[PDB]
Design a binder for these strands. Structure first.
Ligand code: ZN
Lengths: 82, 488, 321, 203, 191, 125
DNA sequence: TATTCCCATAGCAAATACATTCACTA
DNA sequence: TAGTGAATGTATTTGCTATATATG
């Protein structure tokens, strides 16, 4: 019967979210240590024009083994996903 | 085939012009003087600095250019930065020259500069890619498109248009054409447009303007608005002057409270500056603007107009002839737009455009800072700021319409090589038939870009030493007869 | 041209609070804001600085919000310029500070290819090939007989019976290294980082059977284990001649004081890497029971495992000539 | 009337306490030998996020009025980003919607020039060249090679790629077996597209 | 159609060094030969050369003599041309100021052979110019083509130890220790 | 003879993707890595999907797109070919009960961006 | 696939080369 | 007991910051 538009409730999205939540309010860019961590979560950075020779990884690229899929990284606290 | 047959076939076949067939870009850029051994491109650089010497402060001189040894050439392009010497091994066709300057007899730091070299067939390799450099067919002196006279200078480009204004003479309403041009650029950054008569009034007095050029003794035939100007009962140029004067006065009547102030000079400049842009800044600002304007007619542009038959020595003489001799081009042009006979094959003016831009801006810096003592350190920093290693070649493969990628699957040099012609409209990135296409172009060769045959060069064209297209008499009658039937 | 007295912060220049501010500065970025925080003309200067800034991408990428830029520039002007026409100097200083190697540029990307397709970073392995190798690793008997066809089926069967038990345990680097070495004749080694865990467990059982058949029970016991709870890459004199014959391509060494250094055997490097991994932790046995008895063996490491590993590599070198 | 109805019904979902920053994949930074490249429409998103961060990073704590003024500036920046991103990246000819939602670059495809079948033939049959057949039917051939000839996957892949540029009798036999096994159809089904696509017949 | 055969010329480029090494594609059990010589032809499957990533922990698997002869389509990188095409030219660039070279021993006999001859060719060119410059101080005029050739020779030859080494690039692409360019020609049968 | 002898043919069964998970374009470095060009061909433009939605139908048209836009669906296709007794006579390639619709990356990106802005597209009740 | 250039100078951090020592092997 | 190589500490060198009207 066709498609129409709805309005989402953002705090309901916040409540139902799963995993540790990072707030951009808790970051001082002036401290060079905190700027690096902020850019870790915001940008998807590519250091060169080289092909990515990996199939699965965690957030911090500590585990690149496909047989460890589903295991949570101990450095970035992120599950290893494809 | 029979050997006797080939000789008879050869005997009966005319030959192409070797200058066009071998490539005219090579002939115009790399040909060396037998006396001195310096090529055309380097000589062109010398001529650019000759016309710009009038803007140089006293004691500053241009000493010429010198060829660099390969050792210095290697050292310059592998200069160390951040503890790293980057070397680009992709093949290029470049050579290096040094620009020499002196100040009060003391030689300054030479400025190395790279230039491109061309091979047989208009071939050049830039950063590992092959290209073809083709000539551009351009108008000599000036160009007319639509109620506009385009005149290119080495430092500026001017277009002259027309407007109509109403003035009342002896109680009779009359209409006259007013020629205007935009010469200051902050005026574009901004109603009245800058009239040529307004510029004359800014330079000379109104009485001086009328007496010196029009030989008219204007007083205060009676001309009034629609304040009185009186002329003896015994011209078109004077009428245009009157029309421009009233065109300026009518929309700025507060300034002319007393008639005598018309004959001043500062008031006209104030009006012009208010058109372009506080009175104090305005008065000083134009006094420099009129100073640069009076020195804008370079020697190279004078010779180009001389060929057409203009014979102008000062920028004021040019404005007089535009208002007197070239005025009819604004409404009733007698020059065929579709012709190809009175044109010139030009190479360097489009090849060395970026370098020419640097030279002009260098001269403008001196003009903007007149009456100043120059130190050797200041001059060295200025030279380094403008003339850099890759100034001339930094945009050859970007927006130059006469350079195109090469793709030739066979060994022929003519088919898509030295026979490519670039129209003036596409020089920097059709028209009805004309019998000259059969002589200068190739009317059956119809690529997509130029379906009328003006995008290719006839290999039998007659060309003068400077690149001027000449006429062939042995086909003059047949060409002329066809042209009549085309327009009949 | 500057002065250091502690006023080291002014050493590269060309009033009452200058010593205090210099000492505080000397004692991680935009420290001028903090020293300004210690302590109209102020509002006029702020408005002028905001006007100057009013007329980028690089600032945002470095973490400078557009709101914070005027405050930082005002602090810099107040500390480094006012303490030493004033309006023109401040204008030039602000304009210079707004726009300070080529690799430090922050360029704007200009994106028939879509905007998403403009990013052109590829993965290295075709997704279809990974799916193919997942199925291949499940054919243990076929793979084993592709390397050594004399292995009895019963030995392979006994090894495969333990796969289900060890499927719940996590796999460790020493297990993968030995499986990669043995199975390379029929299964690619680099595929181990891409195949799923079930594929790897089958290959670990496959390699264990081959080592059992060849007579390397002392090292085969570690292929199917669980984690319980000096590093020299040189080759013993006994095997140095043989290894250099089977793996002639060696790693060159940096010259010391002009004196050249003999090349290091790369195969010896890998042996030490596996030997260090085995002794890095204690292991719990989960493999075949009969194999555990043939090794004269929670799981103690024999004192000569490096010699056994070296002989295993020697066997593989002869097999792949 | 419409605007009043919209607000009167959705007023309970117009003032959230949290807002989500877009995904990490939206903002891509590529650092090369000639600098780092970024997408210009992303600018407002970066500025909005940094603005909220600077609220607690200020050396002097902000007064309640200054806190609200900075908060509104951040919110106005978020609104600018979503409108510009939808206008410039979702909604255009090379946009997300018209290039990827209603189109795709498919797997198992080929592209080549065409010739004619003038000999006696069936009107709905197609002949593909040798090179296209080897690369297109890579996994079909690998299945046959493993079963019939007891090849490993590595050997099968090596065998297929080796014979793309040369004729091989074994591969040719497998091609016919694949075609003959598509019964009761005459062969392997496919679709041929001609551009531009206007009428039924171009596909 | 046998009388309407065109000929195509093309060039293949490979880079080896700190990241990867060449494989033994044209040699046997006793000879390592990564790519065909001048006058050879491309082998039937069309591979000119292939490179494998560096990894020391996989040496007993990936560095056996058999593994160096076998090309893995999924995990290696190869450059493929027309089978049966005849190699007619080879150009090699080497970075000699590496301590130590990341190339394993015994994998550069062919690379060194062509580089040594090429270095001699460029060395003689630079020697000729220096002799001319000595005799004709300030009287030596050279064409623009010769000037660029001498610049190429200096870019090719090693730099004196007193100065910093060159970082060679090909249009914003950094060269590795080895760069090999192979030119081959093939004749096409229209069908 | 004329140029363009048709030597630039392309054919690929599986192609390498981006970090986003969509087929990528081919650069010059990867042009000669295979005997023939292995590039995904844009055989389904917006105009083609307009035609297919009317003749073939919206149902089957979405299946064809999802087999590429969803990388997991493509992985199911390859496994079906490899495990089939007759690879050219597979009844169903993607088991829609195990891999249901809703996994397409471009659609998920579309939904995510709209959700952040505060809206979502839904079926009319 | 991205280039057309990069002010001079003092202090610091990290990388690097060399000497020394203790444990393993013959 | 003699020879040798890995681990460690220490002095030296160099890359890295941080400030310094104007051309259709
Ligand atoms: Zn991690």
């Amino acid at each position: 019967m066709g498609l129409y538009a709805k309005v989402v409730d953002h705090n309901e999205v916040h409540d139902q979210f799963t995993g540790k939540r990072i707030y951009a309010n808790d970051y001082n860019t002036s401290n060079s240590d905190e700027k690096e961590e902020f850019d870790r979560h915001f940008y998807s950075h590519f250091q060169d024009s080289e092909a990515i020779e990996s199939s699965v990884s965690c957030d911090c690229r500590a585990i690149e083994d496909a047989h460890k899929l589903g295991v949570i990284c101990d450095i970035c606290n992120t599950p290893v996903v494809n | 085939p029979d050997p006797f047959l080939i000789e008879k076939i050869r005997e009966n076949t005319p030959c192409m012009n070797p200058t066009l067939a071998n490539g005219i870009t090579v002939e115009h850029t790399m040909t060396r003087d037998p006396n001195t051994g310096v090529n055309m491109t380097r000589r062109y650089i010398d001529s650019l600095f000759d016309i710009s010497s009038v803007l140089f402060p006293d004691g500053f001189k241009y000493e010429g250019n010198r060829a660099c040894t390969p050792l210095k050439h290697f050292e310059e392009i592998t200069r160390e930065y951040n503890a790293k010497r980057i070397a680009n091994i992709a093949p290029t066709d470049m050579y290096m020259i040094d620009l020499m300057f002196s100040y009060k007899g003391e030689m300054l730091y030479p400025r190395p500069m790279l230039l491109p070299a061309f091979k047989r067939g208009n071939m050049v390799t830039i950063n590992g890619a092959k290209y073809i450099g083709s000539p551009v067919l351009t108008d000599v002196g000036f160009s007319v498109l639509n109620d506009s006279i385009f005149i290119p200078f080495r430092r500026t480009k001017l277009t002259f248009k027309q407007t109509d204004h109403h003035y009342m003479c002896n109680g009779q309403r009359k209409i006259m054409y007013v020629i205007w041009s935009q010469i200051h650029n902050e005026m574009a950054k901004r109603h009245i447009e800058s009239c040529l008569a307004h510029y004359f009034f800014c330079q000379f007095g109104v009485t001086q303007t009328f007496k010196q050029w029009a030989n008219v003794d204007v007083k205060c035939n009676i001309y009034s608005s629609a304040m009185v100007l009186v002329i003896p009962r015994h011209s078109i140029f004077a009428t245009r002057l009157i029309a421009g004067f009233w065109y300026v006065v009518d929309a700025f009547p507060m300034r002319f409270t007393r008639p005598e102030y018309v004959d001043s000079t500062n008031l006209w400049r104030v009006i012009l500056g208010h058109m372009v842009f506080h009175q104090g800044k305005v008065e000083e600002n134009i006094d420099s603007h009129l100073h640069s304007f009076c020195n804008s007619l370079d020697e190279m542009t004078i010779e180009e107009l001389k060929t057409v038959g203009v014979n102008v020595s000062t920028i004021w003489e040019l404005l007089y002839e535009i208002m007197t001799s070239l005025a009819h081009h604004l409404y009733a042009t007698d020059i065929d737009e579709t012709s190809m006979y009175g044109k010139r094959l030009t190479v360097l003016h489009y090849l060395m455009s970026e370098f020419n831009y640097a030279v002009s801006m260098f001269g403008y810096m001196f003009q903007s800072r007149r009456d100043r003592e120059w130190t050797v350190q200041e001059l060295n920093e200025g030279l380094k700021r403008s003339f850099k290693l890759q100034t001339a070649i930094k945009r050859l493969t970007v927006d130059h319409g006469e350079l195109d990628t090469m793709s030739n699957p066979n060994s022929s040099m003519l088919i898509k090589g030295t026979s490519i012609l670039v129209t003036q409209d596409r020089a920097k990135t059709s028209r009805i038939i004309h019998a000259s296409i059969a002589e200068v172009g190739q009317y059956k060769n119809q690529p997509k870009n130029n379906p009328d045959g003006r995008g290719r060069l006839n290999m039998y064209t007659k060309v003068g030493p400077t690149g001027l297209v000449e006429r062939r008499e042995e086909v003059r009658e047949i060409i002329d007869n066809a042209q009549l039937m085309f327009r009949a | 041209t500057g002065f250091t007295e502690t006023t080291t912060a002014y050493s590269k220049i060309r009033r009452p609070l200058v010593p205090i501010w210099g000492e505080f500065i000397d004692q991680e970025m935009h420290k001028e804001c903090e020293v300004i925080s210690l302590i109209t003309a102020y509002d006029k200067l702020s408005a002028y600085v905001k006007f100057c800034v009013e007329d980028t991408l690089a600032n945002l990428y470095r973490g400078m919000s557009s709101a914070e830029v005027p405050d930082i520039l005002q602090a810099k002007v107040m500390v480094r310029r006012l303490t030493i026409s004033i309006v023109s100097n401040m204008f030039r200083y602000v304009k210079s500070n707004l726009n300070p190697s080529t690799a430090d540029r922050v360029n704007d990307k200009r994106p028939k290819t879509s905007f998403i397709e403009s990013h052109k970073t590829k993965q290295r392995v075709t997704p279809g090939d990974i799916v193919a190798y997942n199925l291949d690793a499940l054919d243990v008997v076929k793979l084993v007989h592709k390397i050594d066809d004399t292995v009895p089926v019963e030995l392979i069967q006994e090894c495969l019976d333990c796969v289900a038990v060890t499927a719940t345990k996590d796999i460790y680097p020493h297990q993968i290294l030995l499986a990669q070495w043995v199975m390379h004749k029929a299964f690619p080694a680099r595929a181990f980082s891409h195949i799923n865990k079930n594929a790897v467990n089958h290959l670990l059982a496959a390699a264990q059977s081959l080592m059992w058949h060849w007579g390397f029970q002392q090292v085969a016991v570690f292929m199917q284990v669980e984690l319980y709870y000096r590093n020299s890459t040189r080759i013993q004199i006994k095997y140095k001649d043989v290894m250099d014959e089977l793996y002639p391509h060696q790693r060159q060494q940096r010259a010391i004081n002009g004196v050249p250094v003999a090349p290091v055997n790369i195969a010896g490097i890998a042996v030490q890497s596996a030997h260090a991994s085995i002794r890095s932790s204690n292991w719990i046995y989960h493999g075949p029971d009969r194999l555990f008895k043939e090794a004269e063996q929670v799981l103690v490491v024999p004192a000569t495992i490096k010699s056994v590993i070296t002989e295993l590599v020697i066997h593989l070198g002869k097999l792949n000539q | 009337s419409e605007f009043a109805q919209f607000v009167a019904q959705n007023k309970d979902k117009l003032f959230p306490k949290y807002l989500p920053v877009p995904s990490k994949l939206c903002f891509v930074a590529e650092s090369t030998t000639s600098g780092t490249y970024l997408d210009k429409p992303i600018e407002a998103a970066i500025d909005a996020t940094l603005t909220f961060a600077s609220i607690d990073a200020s050396s002097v704590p902000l007064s309640p009025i200054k806190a609200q003024n900075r908060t509104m500036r951040g919110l106005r920046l978020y609104g600018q980003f979503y409108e510009i991103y939808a206008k410039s990246r979702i909604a255009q000819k090379p946009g997300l919607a018209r290039r990827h939602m209603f189109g795709a670059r498919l797997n198992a495809t080929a592209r080549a020039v065409i010739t004619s079948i003038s000999d006696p033939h069936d009107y709905d049959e197609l002949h593909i060249p040798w090179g296209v057949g080897c690369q297109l039917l890579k996994y079909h051939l690998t299945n046959k090679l493993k079963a019939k000839f007891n090849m490993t996957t590595r050997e099968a892949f090596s065998f297929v790629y080796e014979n793309v540029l040369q004729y091989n009798q074994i591969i040719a036999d497998l091609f016919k077996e694949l075609i003959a096994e598509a019964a009761p159809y005459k062969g392997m089904g496919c679709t041929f597209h001609r551009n531009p696509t206007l009428q039924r017949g171009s596909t | 159609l046998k009388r309407m055969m065109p000929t195509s010329y093309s060039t293949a480029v490979a880079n080896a060094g700190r990241k990867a090494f060449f494989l033994n594609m044209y040699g046997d059990d006793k000879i390592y030969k990564p790519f065909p010589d001048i006058g050879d032809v491309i082998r039937p499957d069309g591979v000119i050369f292939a490179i494998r990533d560096h990894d020391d922990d996989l040496a007993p698997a990936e560095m056996t003599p058999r593994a160096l002869r076998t090309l893995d389509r999924t995990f290696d990188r190869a450059v493929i041309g027309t089978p049966g095409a005849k190699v007619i030219d080879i150009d090699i660039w080497r970075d000699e100021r590496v301590n130590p070279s990341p190339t394993p021993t015994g994998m550069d006999a062919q690379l060194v052979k062509y580089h040594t001859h090429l270095s001699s060719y460029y060395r003689e060119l630079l020697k000729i110019y220096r002799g001319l410059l000595a005799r004709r101080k300030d009287d030596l005029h050279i064409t623009e083509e010769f000037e660029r050739l001498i610049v190429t020779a200096q870019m090719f030859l090693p730099q004196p130890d007193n100065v910093r080494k060159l970082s060679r690039f090909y249009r914003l692409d950094p060269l590795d220790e080895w760069r090999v360019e192979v030119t081959y020609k093939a004749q096409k049968m229209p069908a | 003879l004329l140029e363009k002898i048709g030597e630039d043919w392309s054919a690929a069964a599986s192609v390498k993707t981006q970090p986003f998970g969509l087929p990528s374009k081919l650069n010059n470095a990867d042009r000669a890595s295979t005997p023939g060009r292995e590039t995904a061909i844009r055989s389904f433009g917006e105009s083609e999907t307009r035609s297919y939605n009317c003749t073939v139908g919206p149902g089957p048209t979405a299946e064809i797109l999802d087999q590429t836009n969803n990388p997991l669906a493509h992985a199911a296709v390859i496994e079906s070919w490899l495990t089939a007794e007759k690879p050219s006579s597979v009844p169903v390639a993607v088991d829609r009960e195990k891999i249901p619709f809703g996994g397409s990356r471009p659609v998920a990106m579309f939904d995510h961006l709209l959700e952040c802005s505060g809206i979502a597209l839904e079926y009319a009740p």
